[PDB]
Amino acid sequence: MAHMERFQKVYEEVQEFLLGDAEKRFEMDVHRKGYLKSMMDTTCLGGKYNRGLCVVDVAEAMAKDTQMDAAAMERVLHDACVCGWMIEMLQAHFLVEDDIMDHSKTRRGKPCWYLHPGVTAQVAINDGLILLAWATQMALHYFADRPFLAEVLRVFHDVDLTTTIGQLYDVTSMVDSAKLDAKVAHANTTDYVEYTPFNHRRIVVYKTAYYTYWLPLVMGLLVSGTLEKVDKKATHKVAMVMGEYFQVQDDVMDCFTPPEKIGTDIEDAKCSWLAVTFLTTAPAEKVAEFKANYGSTDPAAVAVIKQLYTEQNLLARFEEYEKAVVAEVEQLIAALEAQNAAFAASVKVLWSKTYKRQ
Amino acid sequence: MAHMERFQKVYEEVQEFLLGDAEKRFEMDVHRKGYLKSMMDTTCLGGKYNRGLCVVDVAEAMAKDTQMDAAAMERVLHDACVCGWMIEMLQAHFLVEDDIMDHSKTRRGKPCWYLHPGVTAQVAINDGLILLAWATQMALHYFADRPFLAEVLRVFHDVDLTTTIGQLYDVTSMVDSAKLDAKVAHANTTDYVEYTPFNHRRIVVYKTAYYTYWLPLVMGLLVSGTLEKVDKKATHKVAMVMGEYFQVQDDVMDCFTPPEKLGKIGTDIEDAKCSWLAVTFLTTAPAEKVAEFKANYGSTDPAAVAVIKQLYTEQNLLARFEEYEKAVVAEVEQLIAALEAQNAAFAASVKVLWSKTY
Ligand SMILES: O=P(O)(O)C(O)(C[n+]1cccc(F)c1)P(=O)(O)O
Ligand SMILES: O=P(O)(O)C(O)(C[n+]1cccc(F)c1)P(=O)(O)O
Ligand SMILES: [Mg+2]
Ligand SMILES: [Mg+2]
Ligand SMILES: [Mg+2]
Ligand SMILES: [Mg+2]
Ligand code: NA
Ligand code: NA
Ligand code: NA
Ligand code: NA
């Protein structure tokens, strides 16, 4: 951990600023102030803060790689926690909104924010918008005298964009893209036309890889003032490789591990690494059976799909994929190390947090 | 006339940049690109563009006052247009979300975006995020090297927060605020505990006045380099006053002025709106008038409606509004005079905007 202490304290610090700023600016009352506090805690807390804490570990390793008096170092660590929370708030913004779009039931053991008894979708959609707003507010306030403010905004807002596009690709893949037309319905169920391993790749990259991997790394570099020290290209590729792997692994785990949440990809008819890899490689009659049973809440259907995946050896094949990814990541790190050991060491520890999640 | 044609041309130019940039950055396919084109056209076009044109009116007024050359003037007019489109997209983004939040049916005599057959709420929620994302993109690209970029992003994102908090106030007027709690379900009907003048003023001011009156003014001073030529808080204050007044006037005409003098029914009583009329009445009326109000408000029977309008007359609410209107006329003219003493051209921009609000 190490930076968990520091990170949770900045949250409390940031919460108080954010609520206080609303009282100052928008005549905020005690009742709704209290509502926004429960809103923040419920949507932003619970996770393991891997993405936020990445900003911190990156920043630390870069500032430790220069000669910095404790004072500058402490400012770099605080600034890294604020970027960290910007990303956690960005994510939380996308979970809130995405749970409403998908009519999802639960989120980390609990009902989705919009299904909290005294919230409702009507309030929750705007709640989502407040969290995004707040992310920019942190930067505007905490980085007001920092040379990296313009860059943080640019890169954070490009990733907001990137992720909305990944979102677009993920909710417009139910039907052959050629039939997509605002003023004509195709409705209900998928035809699997877009369900190609490449299109899945396109989805995960924009929807997940940038905000989960690329954004923490760069904010890391931006707050520590070390962006010009590393190759843009290599930073992008390694973010993409890890980002791809992480989702491929989350997809496999949804279906394959006990794990003690309840995995719901099959019944939701998710465009998953499992689904796309199966559809493009399995024998003809298997494909027929898959299509007959996919995207059903019925537990018999779900069990058939899982049995089809097992017969296709998809678990062992993932581990093959995993091993091919190990090779790539290790190659990309070794290449980064030749340019800056501090950053590469950092990337080596973010890999160890992604690799073989259990 | 005058700048409408220039505004439309710029729209096309930004649409082309935005869609192309998506093709460049995210591998945007032809079909999803055509979808986003119709999403943009449907949500952003067909309105009055009054907020967007206002920026251009203001920017031109200030630019002529500086006596700058032809090449520079064109840049200022083009910058104004882009900014104007930031506001329209921001508005557009909030309509898309609000129509989903409130399960609205129509928008400018057309089905709401999410109600278009090949668009559901599941996609349309995210469409709205894209629109808000596009607003920042425009500034990031067109103003990449303009000195006013930081202030445009700050002012823009500050108004985005203000508007989400105005939305919050609007969606939390259902029950008594002492009862508002995420954990506890409340009725989907109104108890009128939040129907107060204070509350009505927060809703209109933070939900509407910042983006409708404040932002256009400040964007225009920003793109023409003239912000330091006006008093910031006289400008803000005049914006808050007009903005509140526009909505009070709207509520009154919705009830009192005939269907002929503004092509539309007039449905505020029947929809149970937190109107200026409702909140002024409940906060001042005798107890049994109040009890009669509650017994007849929010239902669609012409009998009950006529009763409410009788009650409004019997409380002399027109004279009350007339006294209110008189007070704002005085106040706005005072602030315009103050602005004239430092800058005459900006005062005339505010004048013309004001005369548009009567
Ligand atoms: O597994 P989840 O529920 O975290 C999910 O990734 C949501 N989600 C997470 C992050 C960003 C996003 F836009 C959307 P998905 O929709 O089920 O794939
Ligand atoms: O009078 P309407 O219905 O156009 C409204 O102002 C829409 N609207 C306009 C601006 C922002 C907002 F989110 C929502 P309302 O708030 O639904 O009454
Ligand atoms: Mg989803
Ligand atoms: Mg998952
Ligand atoms: Mg509304
Ligand atoms: Mg109205
Ligand atoms: Na914002
Ligand atoms: Na501020
Ligand atoms: Na954005
Ligand atoms: Na760019």
TrEMBL record, chain B:
<comment type="similarity">
    <text>Belongs to the FPP/GGPP synthase family.</text>
</comment>
<dbReference type="InterPro" id="IPR039702">
    <property type="entry name" value="FPS1-like"/>
</dbReference>
<dbReference type="Pfam" id="PF00348">
    <property type="entry name" value="polyprenyl_synt"/>
</dbReference>
<feature type="binding site">
    <location>
        <position position="250"/>
    </location>
    <ligand>
        <name>Mg(2+) 2</name>
    </ligand>
</feature>
<feature type="binding site">
    <location>
        <position position="102"/>
    </location>
    <ligand>
        <name>Mg(2+) 1</name>
    </ligand>
</feature>
<dbReference type="GO" id="GO:0004161">
    <property type="term" value="F:dimethylallyltranstransferase activity"/>
</dbReference>
<dbReference type="GO" id="GO:0045337">
    <property type="term" value="P:farnesyl diphosphate biosynthetic process"/>
</dbReference>
<dbReference type="GO" id="GO:0004337">
    <property type="term" value="F:(2E,6E)-farnesyl diphosphate synthase activity"/>
</dbReference>
<feature type="binding site">
    <location>
        <position position="98"/>
    </location>
    <ligand>
        <name>Ca(2+) 1</name>
    </ligand>
</feature>
<dbReference type="InterPro" id="IPR008949">
    <property type="entry name" value="Isoprenoid_synthase_dom_sf"/>
</dbReference>
<dbReference type="GO" id="GO:0046872">
    <property type="term" value="F:metal ion binding"/>
</dbReference>
<feature type="binding site">
    <location>
        <position position="250"/>
    </location>
    <ligand>
        <name>Ca(2+) 4</name>
    </ligand>
</feature>
<feature type="binding site">
    <location>
        <position position="102"/>
    </location>
    <ligand>
        <name>Ca(2+) 2</name>
    </ligand>
</feature>
<feature type="binding site">
    <location>
        <position position="250"/>
    </location>
    <ligand>
        <name>Ca(2+) 3</name>
    </ligand>
</feature>
<feature type="binding site">
    <location>
        <position position="98"/>
    </location>
    <ligand>
        <name>Mg(2+) 1</name>
    </ligand>
</feature>
<feature type="binding site">
    <location>
        <position position="170"/>
    </location>
    <ligand>
        <name>Mg(2+) 1</name>
    </ligand>
</feature>
<keyword id="KW-0106">Calcium</keyword>
<feature type="binding site">
    <location>
        <position position="98"/>
    </location>
    <ligand>
        <name>Ca(2+) 2</name>
    </ligand>
</feature>
<dbReference type="GO" id="GO:0005737">
    <property type="term" value="C:cytoplasm"/>
</dbReference>
<dbReference type="InterPro" id="IPR033749">
    <property type="entry name" value="Polyprenyl_synt_CS"/>
</dbReference>
<feature type="binding site">
    <location>
        <position position="102"/>
    </location>
    <ligand>
        <name>Ca(2+) 1</name>
    </ligand>
</feature>
<feature type="binding site">
    <location>
        <position position="251"/>
    </location>
    <ligand>
        <name>Ca(2+) 4</name>
    </ligand>
</feature>
<keyword id="KW-0808">Transferase</keyword>
<protein>
    <submittedName>
        <fullName>Farnesyl pyrophosphate synthase</fullName>
        <ecNumber>2.5.1.1</ecNumber>
        <ecNumber>2.5.1.10</ecNumber>
    </submittedName>
</protein>
<keyword id="KW-0460">Magnesium</keyword>
<dbReference type="InterPro" id="IPR000092">
    <property type="entry name" value="Polyprenyl_synt"/>
</dbReference>
<keyword id="KW-0479">Metal-binding</keyword>
<feature type="binding site">
    <location>
        <position position="170"/>
    </location>
    <ligand>
        <name>Ca(2+) 2</name>
    </ligand>
</feature>
